[PDB]
Amino acid sequence: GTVIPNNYCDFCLGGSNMNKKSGRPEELVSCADCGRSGHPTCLQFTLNMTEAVKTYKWQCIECKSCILCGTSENDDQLLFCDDCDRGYHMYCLNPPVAEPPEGSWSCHLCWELLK
């Protein structure tokens, strides 16, 4: 479509040349669907999450849709993987999940790849 990644971070307004929160250059990551961008540290991503989100068509929080069913319904039930940030409805998982776990939850794609 008409998407172009924004050249500034939604959080600190800096470009990739200078994160205004950290005072260091830092690449931006950009939503594949809407083009909004953020510095990974402004997005509060770990370094390994930062690498992961650059490997697929990462979506921002607002655009995130479930990998399994494709919808963005039921925000309260759309889990975000703590290793790759992909979204999965708790009710699209099999077995489905009643409540977000405590501490990290990671998706089946990451379990397959890293373990």
């Binding site: 929080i61 759309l78 703590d82 979204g87 977000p100």
Partner: peptide, 15 residues
Amino acid sequence: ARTKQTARKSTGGKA
């Protein structure tokens, strides 16, 4: 764990 809802609430600086 994070959901879209809890992630929105803890990342309040996003434009």
